[PDB]
Design a protein around this ligand. Structure first.
Ligand SMILES: CN(Cc1ccc2c(c1C(=O)O)OCO2)C(=O)N[C@@H](C(=O)NC(C)(C)C)c1ccccc1
Ligand SMILES: CN(Cc1ccc2c(c1C(=O)O)OCO2)C(=O)N[C@@H](C(=O)NC(C)(C)C)c1ccccc1
Ligand SMILES: [Cl-]
Ligand SMILES: [Cl-]
Lengths: 149, 149
């Protein structure tokens, strides 16, 4: 449970935003890419797994699930790929709500950045620091420290 | 102390690798860029601060310290910029040793990646997971959870 992440892909300004959400905390990492490809997803996972202890990934669609480069990256990083099919329905509407929320934060910061990628990183910052009260960034640290001890 | 990071910039294959080290733990994040510019450094810091609670950054050289874009990013993210002048000299030997170590890991994985950037991310993974026994990734989580409670 401390090691479960969900991939999510959303669109804005004719570009793609790739998001990884730490399920138990709501913490996210995100990037802007021109298109969702196996290779971009593979590279993103590799970055994620070097930064946080990623045990399981619920991939966002079947193409990435099937991608040989995504599989090679998951093999390399020790990640177990699963089919993020929502038996928990809330999780599906949780994503949709997250995408909406994230686009809301992006629009609020949009004017402070020339490039979408900067605005996305500002939005990641705001999301992870927003106190709900613990922040998502505080929750992920706590969940994983607990898991270690 | 849980919030202190050090920037470091090293060279390989005619490219630049930008590294942020969490001083208390030895944990790192890293990226490949074509050249160290104010803007690249600013963007990197913005990414870092949305992911970990960055309070202080010891910048790697005076150009980045002076850069208006680096200052704007640090203002935005709430980061206090300092001049990473090694008042403790090592420190300075610690970085040099880290750069050497990191290039050693890169050469060991180099054949498993077409592009240098992938090899760098493999090396970050190996570095952060290497048990030394707690890993750097375990140490940073523990230091920050402690700080929260
Ligand atoms: C802290 N930032 C954000 C930032 C940091 C690093 C980056 C960025 C950006 C970005 O604006 O997307 O793009 C790549 O690396 C600024 O100070 N941005 C200024 C600005 O002069 N931006 C540049 C230098 C023309 C790119 C700005 C210009 C226009 C409008 C609003 C702000
Ligand atoms: C898990 N990875 C690493 C990887 C993942 C994602 C990426 C990458 C790379 C990379 O190799 O740098 O480049 C950007 O997005 C592989 O399976 N690499 C293969 C491979 O065929 N890679 C491509 C498809 C030619 C890019 C490989 C090619 C040559 C030598 C060794 C391995
Ligand atoms: Cl944070
Ligand atoms: Cl880790």
């Amino acid at each position: 449970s401390p090691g479960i992440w969900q991939l999510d892909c959303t669109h804005l300004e004719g570009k793609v935003i790739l998001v990884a959400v730490h399920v138990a905390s709501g913490y996210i990492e995100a990037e802007v890419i021109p298109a969702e490809t196996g290779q971009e997803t593979a590279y993103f996972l590799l970055k994620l797994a070097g930064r946080w202890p990623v045990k399981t990934v619920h991939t966002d669609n079947g193409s990435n699930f099937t991608s040989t480069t995504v599989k090679a990256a998951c093999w390399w990083a020790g990640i177990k790929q699963e089919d993020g099919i929502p038996y928990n329905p809330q999780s599906q509407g949780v994503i949709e709500s997250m995408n909406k929320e994230l686009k809301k934060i992006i629009g609020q910061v949009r004017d402070q950045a020339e490039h979408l990628k900067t605005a996305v990183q500002m939005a990641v910052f705001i999301h992870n620091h927003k106190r709900k009260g613990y922040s998502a960034g505080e929750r992920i640290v706590d969940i994983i420290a607990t898991d270690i001890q």
